[PDB]
Each structure stands twice: as C-alpha cells, then as structure tokens.
Amino acid sequence: PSLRKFHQLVAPFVGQLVVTVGGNSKKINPNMLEMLRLQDSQVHGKNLYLNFGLTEDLGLPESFLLPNSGLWLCFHFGLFGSVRASELSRATKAKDPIPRLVLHFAKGFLAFYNCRIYWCLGPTVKPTSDILSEEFDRRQALEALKQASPVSYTLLDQRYFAGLGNIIKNEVLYLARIHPLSLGSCLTPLNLESLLDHVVSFSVGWLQKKLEGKPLHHLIYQKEQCPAGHQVMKDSFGPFQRLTWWCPHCQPKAE
C-alpha cells in the first residue's frame, strides 16, 4: 500500500462538498460529514488524514456567534488496504469486497477498503501522543504516569496525553475512583491501567456524544453531589491552575 498513490487519488476532491456517504462502517457515523467540505488531505507514516469543515474567508465559519476548526478522520491502511476513485474494487476469487467508507462528491467518489477509520486530533500532533488514535503509545503514557507528580498534572501534559482537557481529566479521574492529587508513584498498577483505559474509553464516547449533539450527562464535572451522593469538592490545581471536582469519599488520597 503506497500512500502516495492514495493521496494522489484523494487530491482532486479537496475543497469539494460531500454530498452523501456510504459503506458498512457506521461506528463513526459518517453521516456527520454531509454538507461538509474536504478541506485538507495529508499523509504521514502509513496513515492518511482528511479534514472536513466549513471555513470561509479569514478562517471564519459560515455562520458565526461570538457572542469549529474542522474534523479530522484518520485512515490506517493495513497490508491490503486501498482507496478507489469513482470506481469499485472487485473480488479476487476467495463476493465483491464491501467498502468501509464511500464519500460522494459531485465530481466523483472515494471508496476505502480494508482500513481502520477513526476520528483523531489531526496531523499536527504526533499519533503516539493522540489519545483518540488507535496508535496510542501506552508505554510512553504509563512512563509519564509513573512519575512523581500528581495524576492531574501528568494527565494534562499534552506531550503524552494530547487532546486531554479539563472535563476528560475530571471524569476519567472519578471513573477510576482515584484522588486528583494522588502521586503516580504511590498508585497501584491496577489503578494505573484502569485510569489509562478509561481515558481511551471516555474520550471516544464523549466525542461521539458531542458530534451527534446528544445531551451528555456529567458524572462529577460541575456536579454538587456524586453519583453515590457524597458532596463534591471544588478547588483549583495545576503545575497554570485549572478548576477540579472530586469526591473525597469515593476518591481517597492513599499516601
């Protein structure tokens, strides 16, 4: 799979609106891409990055209230991954293969075969740091987590947990039932693995909930009482300070 050819195929569609979508991969719900423009396409290290959005002059969206910057889709091509332009592949005597995704433009369409398709932060950040990307360097992440500093400070480090902000920090911390100020050296590997997995789970879940616009129920973020019902405490901590919520009863400090 030479991704240079794939990029050459994708290039004529850059700047064109997406009319409709098809395929059998509905995990990302590609119908979000309707009436959006393929604003950019780039290739870096066995991955293909496509950007969809509505950017007008000066970088402003179409309709503005004072009162986004586009979505990035990552395509990780395996040994037999491929993309087609205005044509569909046929089987080689093993029924025709079904494309994972088909994007329709007025000029033509693109079909992607045998590839992993997931949202990502984009090319600007290294995929190893990206928490959304499947190619997430969990070795690097745990090496960062085992440091002396409290877990909130390490989690907010974009070099190793890129894309992780305040809300994900608080929710992932409550889900593992660990205190925000607990040290990464003074935590069990069980809790560390649970936290690291909850990162990847809650990130993609929250992203999918936010894209579809469905109302999201916050567990501990800006909540007066925890799910169990204990009063929630609020204070500011940082390595630059940020607002934090935690339940001391649910999340002991644990020396």
**CB of 73 or CB of 220, closer to Zn ion:** 220
Binding residues: 226, 230, 247, 250
CA pair distance 172, 41, nearest whole angstrom: 32
- In the numeric block, the tokens 């959005």 are attached to 53
- Smallest separation, CB 235 to Zn ion (Å): 16
- Smallest separation, CB 169 to Zn ion (Å): 18
**Phi and psi for 55 in degrees, rounded to 5?**
-105, 120
Residues at the site binding Zn ion, with contacts judged by CB under 5 A: 226, 228, 230, 247, 249-250
Peptide bond into 67 cis (omega under 30): yes
**CB of 29 or CB of 225, closer to Zn ion:** 225
CA 107, 109, 114 angle in degrees (round to 5)? 160
Which residues sit opposite 84 in a β-bridge? 111
**CB of 120 or CB of 247, closer to Zn ion:** 247
Binding residues for Zn(2+): 226, 230, 247, 250
**CB of 55 or CB of 194, closer to Zn ion:** 194
CA pair distance 140, 255, nearest whole angstrom: 24
**Token representation of residue 125:** 């950040």
- Smallest separation, CB 232 to Zn ion (Å): 7
- Smallest separation, CB 197 to Zn ion (Å): 21
The four Cα atoms 206, 20, 64, 13 give a dihedral, to 10 degrees, of: 110
